Write a protein that binds this ligand. Structure first.
Ligand SMILES: [Ca+2]
Ligand SMILES: [Ca+2]
Ligand SMILES: [Ca+2]
Ligand SMILES: [Ca+2]
Ligand SMILES: [Zn+2]
Lengths: 616, 309, 77
DNA sequence: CACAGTGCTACAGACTGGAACAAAAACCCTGCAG
DNA sequence: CACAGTGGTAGTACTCCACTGTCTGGCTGTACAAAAACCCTGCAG
């Protein structure tokens, strides 16, 4: 039987059928090799018909894959942290032994890639963007942006890589086309109609990172600290044709997750030195400023449609909020980024203030400090300008950061407990010896009951586990006085009562009663602090206690949320950055930022995360 | 446009084609429609096929797949550094789309390796070892080795784990059986005979490792530095019946590789202090010093054979 | 990477004196040529000549150390 | 003279196509053989 | 009131190893008509 001989062997057999199919291809199709054999064989198998093969023969060509489709292979490789070379190892293994290979080769995965990265879909900005090129196919650009490397100027030491802003925007926006059209159908809105009234709200974050080791390479020399600038799409809603203040279509269900945080720019720069950070990150701010005005026109769902963008920079820590706005940092006399009170007026009256600071007034105050029209002395001009000693570089929405606020308050209560173990308000001047002894007994008691090893620095998780009532009642037994016990216990209770207003995604729905009583509860909190703990809070408050006892109701009223705009998305993305610089990038100084950027853009797509569930 | 019409139009689109095919089958191959129509695709596609033509054509009734043996799946999982939960994610995704499931579930892998780990094969020493129990199924044993944790003594601040020496050795030797049999074959020495004089030379190594971060956990408090005792089978040779110092069979071609270094004991202990290190590592050195004397008996390649170390 | 010869060539350029520039290069040469005996897997096969010459080469290395670097290797080895 | 990778790029071998050839595998078929 | 994990164990839920008859859906030889959609041509502005 011919099924036992080689494929070369068969030469003599099928000559006449090849002649017949070549003659037949002319008169009806023109060269269609596939169909003339496909519809013949699939139907001739069903002549003596068992359906066992009818399933195998139906999906063989068109839908879907046969084997698993290349896009499914790409998703099951990116979303499980499989290195390319490990995947090729698995591919060879599953194919050579009993295959019938299922996965696709590497070079066809790499070909289904150029559709996901930016620089593939066409778009149009109306009107034309200001001092921004109109070419829509730019991929990964080097962040140096044309430095005249010549030796006599400032050196070009910094390596950097970045997409263009609008191109990554339109790609990460067209990726959500599935869910935007499904929201359009769910709300049952008109499709052909109401195409130009969309509105996008986008949270962007910035952050630095320490002790990133460096490599030998070939140069140039580079610092260890790395800086990562990334953005995330929070919500997309519709406006036309009337007032209809909000008609949401898509809202990110989990804004703090890794899976929704899109990297835009990576640098090997320190955060401290302003010169290099501003030189590299200048073009991004110019793109943002020129993009806030114009409207995007994108082909989605079969039709071209017009979008507008709204940016809210909220993912910055206080060090960077003060750097990017020129204020002095951070143990300064002026504690609040939003208000103008000094340390004294904020230890005196804790719970009454109003938000004033913004971008435009800070620019104008730098102008006043520089022109100095009244010939004032330095120390008093500083008070007249209220801490603006530098020109603001970038606009950030006036909001509080959740995670570092929780950490600040947890370190504050940890210091209070330490003071309490010993008697601090009887003997006001202790030594370092007794301080270390009190800290040691506090850590031993916390480890014995709460199951918490000591910490070098207060990370978020130790701050969630420390400020709970079990821990306080585990430290209440150490403090001998029976009145201080009740005091700090009611303090912890008030704090646990006011926490979910700021730490929740939407306090307006998940915890309305705690929202309604935040002002009064903070009043009682500050009253207990002023009364009983005055030995510690006479004239010195931390800047986070002020932010959380004065400005929280106004913040949650302005936008409607706090924790949903936290810096979690970037902080946690740093983990992905480290695991992608060690496992998935070329080991060289020249190329490796490009690989981390590409793989981290692929991990954070929605279209490749649709296949991880595959309808359960 | 030939994309989606039903049967009874392609019927008369290809009536003459199928009549000619049946005529050819009757003229030369008797008339077996299936064998003809299955082979029609081979040459028509192969004029220009990429590679997937051959795969989807060999996807015929033969093969076949139902999926790889669970051992191959286990090897893929332990050699691509895939976490168990990530592997289950891959399994669910590959079965839900177009499956036809290939990979095995987790619960059949968990019983698939019960042979590879120690404490499975039967073995016995002679003469019986000193100060070592004869149970041959001891798996992962806690290294503390019966410390009377009671408060007044020196406390047990150490979390450690270790395989017993003899059991991990007989499993690492029973695993290399393929290569020692193949060496006997290539060397053209008789397999059944002169099986009593083997000799196994084993390189052992001990090392510490700094700044292993501690966990919150329950207790007790533990230092951060860890110590990792491991060993590796360097070479195995034959001497019997004699006249040769040795006749080598298996020699590790890549001794320094990370693929050939078998861990034996893990501890959370500092290297500087001596009392904790020696109290944990007492038993290992004891049964090692007691093992150099006697000879091991294993059932390998079908027969009972004797080993020295 | 630093024990190779083309690396001693980048250092010999900073040393102003010439006799020392030759001395340290002769030292690097002797070392590159006695290293593979104890770094190789099986020196009895891959490099037999270096194994046969290790005694004389070590003698000469020690002689050069005592001669032109005595100020450092008087009593600390 | 650690060693298993770290991904992208480059070019080596595996394919067709008729022309035509040889060697071989093995049926069957004739010569010369008792 | 982050969040996606980390592997093992107990529990539920289901989907199957064998015996059995019965049932429907869909294959095959041409004949027979109803719809499909251009294209012709026919008669009219
Ligand atoms: Ca940081
Ligand atoms: Ca920082
Ligand atoms: Ca050490
Ligand atoms: Ca060491
Ligand atoms: Zn304020």
């Amino acid at each position: 039987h011919l099924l036992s001989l080689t494929r070369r062997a068969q030469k003599h057999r099928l000559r006449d059928l090849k002649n017949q199919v070549k003659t037949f291809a002319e008169k009806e199709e023109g060269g269609d090799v596939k169909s003339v054999c496909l519809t013949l064989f699939l139907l001739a198998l069903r002549a003596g018909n068992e359906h066992k093969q009818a399933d195998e023969l139906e999906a063989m060509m068109q839908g879907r894959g046969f084997g698993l489709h290349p896009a499914v292979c790409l998703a099951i490789r990116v979303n499980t942290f499989l290195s390319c070379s490990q995947y090729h190892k698995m591919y060879r293994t599953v194919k050579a032994t009993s295959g019938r290979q299922i996965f696709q080769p590497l070079h066809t995965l790499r070909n289904a890639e150029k559709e996901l990265l930016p620089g593939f879909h066409q778009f149009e900005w109306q009107p034309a963007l200001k001092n921004v090129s109109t070419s829509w196919d730019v991929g990964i650009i080097d962040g140096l942006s044309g430095w005249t490397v010549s030796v006599d100027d400032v050196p070009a030491d910094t390596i950097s890589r970045r997409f263009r802003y609008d191109v990554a925007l339109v790609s990460a926006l067209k990726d959500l086309e599935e869910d935007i059209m499904e929201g359009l159908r769910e709300r049952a809105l008109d499709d052909s109609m109401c195409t130009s009234g969309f509105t996008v709200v986008v949270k962007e974050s910035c952050d630095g990172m320490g002790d990133v080791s460096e490599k030998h390479g070939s140069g140039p020399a580079v610092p260890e600290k790395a800086v990562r600038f990334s953005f995330t799409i929070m919500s997309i809603s519709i406006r036309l044709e009337g007032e209809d203040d909000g008609i949401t279509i898509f809202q990110e269900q989990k804004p703090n997750s890794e899976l929704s945080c899109r990297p835009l720019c990576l640098m090997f720069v320190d955060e401290s030195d302003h010169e290099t950070l501003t030189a590299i990150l200048g073009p991004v701010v110019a793109e943002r400023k020129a993009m806030m005005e114009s409207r995007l026109i994108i082909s989605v769902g079969g039709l071209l449609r017009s979008f507008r963008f709204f940016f809210r920079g909220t993912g910055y820590d206080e060090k960077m909020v003060r750097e990017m706005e020129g204020l002095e940092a951070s143990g300064s006399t002026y504690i609040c980024t939003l208000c103008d009170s000094t340390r004294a007026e904020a230890s005196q009256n804790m719970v009454l203030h109003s938000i004033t600071r913004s971008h435009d007034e800070n620019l104008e105050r730098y102008e006043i400090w520089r022109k100095n029209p009244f010939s004032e002395s330095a120390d008093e001009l500083r008070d007249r300008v209220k801490g603006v000693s530098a020109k603001p570089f970038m606009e950030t929405q006036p909001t509080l950061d959740a995670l570092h606020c929780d950490i600040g308050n947890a370190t504050e209560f940890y210091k209070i407990f330490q003071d309490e173990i010993g008697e601090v308000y009887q003997k006001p001047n202790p030594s370092r010896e007794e301080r270390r002894r009190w800290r040691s007994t506090l850590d031993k008691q916390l480890r014995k009951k709460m199951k918490l090893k000591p910490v070098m620095r207060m990370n978020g998780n130790y701050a969630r586990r420390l400020m709970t009532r079990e821990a306080v009642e585990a430290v209440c037994e150490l403090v001998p006085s029976e009145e201080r016990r009740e005091a700090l216990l009611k303090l912890m209770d008030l704090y646990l009562q006011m926490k979910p207003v700021w730490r929740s995604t939407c306090p307006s729905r998940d915890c309305p009663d705690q929202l309604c009583q935040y002002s009064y509860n903070s009043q009682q909190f500050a009253d207990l602090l002023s009364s009983m703990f005055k030995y510690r809070y006479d004239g010195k408050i931390t800047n986070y206690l002020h932010k959380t006892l004065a400005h929280v109701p106004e913040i949650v009223e302005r936008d409607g949320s706090i924790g949903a705009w936290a810096s979690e998305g970037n902080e946690s993305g740093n983990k992905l950055f480290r695991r992608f610089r060690k496992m998935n990038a070329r080991q060289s100084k020249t190329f490796e930022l490009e690989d981390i950027l590409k793989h981290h853009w692929l991990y954070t797509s929605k279209y490749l995360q649709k296949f991880m569930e595959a309808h359960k």
